[PDB]
Symmetry: D2
Subunit: 114 residues, 4 copies
């Protein structure tokens, strides 16, 4: 599993459950095209987005549908989504974890590359 995503809720102190996550890869022009997607588990994790064969060098955008998440909880959100854009495999393949921490008017994201 070369790309994992983990989403935490800073208002409730819990994983962010059932959050929709869409991954895009940048194409020959510049257009963003869909690559992978899923919903966070009860642990706030999304595994099996890709396989190593499919996850080649490139620029990727991970867009976290945080707006719908807060909306489901009846909380007023600021962002349309959180968007994490990065080059992967700059030097061949690695394991990537993209972690996001969500609040209504703020978010932070970090990458663990191993």
């Amino acid at each position: 599993c070369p790309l994992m995503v983990k989403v935490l809720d800073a208002v409730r102190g819990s994983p962010a459950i059932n959050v929709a996550v869409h991954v895009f890869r940048k194409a020959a022009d510049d257009t963003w095209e869909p690559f992978a997607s899923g919903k966070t588990s009860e642990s706030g994790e999304l595994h099996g987005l890709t396989t190593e064969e499919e996850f080649v060098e490139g620029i990727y955008k991970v867009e976290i549908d945080t707006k719908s998440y807060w909306k489901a909880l009846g909380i007023s959100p600021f962002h349309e989504h959180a968007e994490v854009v990065f080059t992967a495999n700059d030097s061949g393949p690695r394991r990537y974890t993209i972690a996001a921490l969500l609040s209504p008017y703020s978010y932070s994201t970090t990458a663990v590359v191993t």
Copy 2:
């Protein structure tokens, strides 16, 4: 100044100076139109991006070019940029400050919205 950006560097404990910022606005056809752009000052602030007349309702994206910033400091970062997408002025005009805190493999962004 209805749209301001403030950027800090968490490695060096300082404002993030001369960071490129581009602001786009979603167009009728679901596409991102250039809206405004600038570079942060020695205080890590970017003022004068727009005006209250030009800053109408819409969905805006503030892209902070964190990759050039880190490279111009000699360091290889993870992110292509730090992005913040939000709907603005939907219930009247508001003043927005977008603050971002940068590290090479992480960033944080917050919006302070006042009336």
Copy 3:
């Protein structure tokens, strides 16, 4: 103003107003002496905690009373307080801004240190 604190609220997208802050300094006997205290203004800023003469070298702790803040907003938070402990002025005097971003189960703090 060699020691300033700025506090934001990430739930409401605003400065965190009337937040109590206490600053302690480690004493010769390894104990925390009261140094300064105040409350943030409507801009979430706390100025005038100290003076450059009083702010000598040492290890300081800035305690931000996030628990009272959240309670006075009607909400049950995780942390007793947000704390930041750092050595100051060890290689000459410096100006420090301690910025903190608050959520009920999380907080972030950054220091901006200028010369």
Copy 4:
């Protein structure tokens, strides 16, 4: 395992390995007294700090020796440590994860309570 700690490095994009973590419980006066301690694993995690029997309601301080961590990497740090102070079991016992994300001049911490 009712108290876990996880520490990530935002400069290197990796778990923060071999970081010393000291937990204290507040006593009848106010004095802080040692309760638990350990070093982060290769995954940046510290498990087995306590057991449920031992981890009762109270105020706890988790102090993360971030200064020595950066020092070991030859990077100049700002903080003496990161300190996370919280009431636990306010309403009986829970599982607590305290997560910290470290930079030389910044840190963020969040609690996942389950």
